[PDB]
Symmetry: C3
């Protein structure tokens, strides 16, 4: 999968090791090999949630297959938990958008998937 | 609703309270509870529109329902106007990608909206 | 179309005129009018690909209508070729997500397309 986090929480508060932990945990959760997992964190952002500048996060999980009701709930729980634990962002100020990418619509290594 | 603005307009040009303004106008325009309205502004971007460096913006508005023909026309007029008045970006150098997210694909507060 | 590059390659490693080259090349590959081609490059990002933080890119290319595997493979090679040659990014560490936007869900110039 591809996972992206945008947040108003500053650079300093992003623990070293956090990108690795997202890669590890996302492999463990999705049933996907970690070699192709991409993770992206953007701190120091001018954003708001409900109008308020209290810590928040706008996130994105792109996957080729394996997206739906029950799975997206378990990923939400895992990643909210991780953002709360590591960046002190409350779960109710996190949004995670899930996308099921069709294989031909994902470019990689001078071509596309499958 | 989630609204994101990326622009080559510098940090200094974004007026104080712009995020709240976007949150008020989006709450009106969509009829949605204000607590669910997220906004994000990214200034100083290395962007071009038509190959030119002139002020421009690339935006997106994600929502669970309330996305379609007339609504999007109206959102575009509202939002381009706000970007013209506040950021001094000509409407013809603005894109806003609209997305109608299914409830099961939007994570929040340790779960999804399903 | 709209092309967006996010990378951990620094600001300085991005050559001058790279946005015009991307605009040039996208116009000649796709046949689309250059005036509506939007490009966005975001250097110095905190990201990892396959657990590792060697130079990488997570990209997107949005078009109105008409997406297929033949075109996407050609765009992938073209775009991967430009990132190798100019940004020193190995093609096996580049994702490009393709999207077929409906005309009505792309806001522009106070209205939407078609
Ligand atoms: O988890 C995925 O399905 C997966 C998803 C993506 C992706 C990048 N942007 N949008 C989607 C890339 C590689 C993947 O992993 C693969 C690993 C091996 C073979 C095929 C895909
Ligand atoms: O190349 C495209 O398909 C195209 C894509 C977009 C777009 C913006 N955000 N997401 C997609 C806008 C105009 C386009 O070009 C057009 C040219 C003429 C008429 C309509 C669209």
């Amino acid at each position: 999968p591809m996972f992206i986090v945008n947040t108003n929480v500053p650079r300093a508060s992003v623990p070293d090791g956090f990108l690795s932990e997202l890669t590890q945990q996302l492999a463990q959760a999705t049933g996907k090999p970690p070699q192709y997992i991409a993770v992206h964190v953007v701190p120091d952002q001018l954003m708001a949630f409900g109008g308020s500048s209290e810590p928040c996060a706008l996130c994105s999980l792109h996957s080729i297959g394996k997206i739906g009701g029950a799975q997206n709930r378990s990923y939400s729980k895992l990643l909210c938990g991780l953002l709360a634990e590591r960046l002190r962002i409350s779960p109710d100020r996190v949004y995670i958008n899930y996308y099921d990418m069709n294989a031909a619509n994902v470019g990689w290594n001078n071509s596309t998937f499958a």
